[PDB]
Amino acid sequence: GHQQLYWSHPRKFGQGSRSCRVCSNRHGLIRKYGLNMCRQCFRQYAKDIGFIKLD
């Protein structure tokens, strides 16, 4: 039954296919340069990745 009803929607594309690397949420996602991050956790974890603000 549920062994053949878990996978009715193969997560290949769409919004539910991709998610953030932090909180498993799907809003404000950064996919440029492969961060897979939401914006707020990117802000509070921006300093320790080797980024400093210049301009």
């Binding site: 950064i30 440029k32 340069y33 914006r39 707020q40 990117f42 802000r43 921006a46 080797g50 980024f51 400093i52 603000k53 210049l54 301009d55």
Partner: protein, 100 residues
Amino acid sequence: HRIRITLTSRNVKSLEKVCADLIRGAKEKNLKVKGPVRMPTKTLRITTRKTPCGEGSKTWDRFQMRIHKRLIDLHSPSEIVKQITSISIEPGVEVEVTIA
């Protein structure tokens, strides 16, 4: 016997220090060495939003990441280049050796 070493780093002053170290080493090794080739740099422009909510002024920010890649050209045999590659390392750069 053309061998090339590409030098990239997060920072710029440590990159120039390491590049000066390898240029001075190839100079005291008494061989034919090309000077430090100055490749153009790339700038990572990232723009996010300040407000976690949608309240207040629409104040964006600008995030900059500076990548600095360089290369030098050597005319030394392979084992000497491997030894000077394996010596004088730092946790800011990556070593990378091409034989061509």
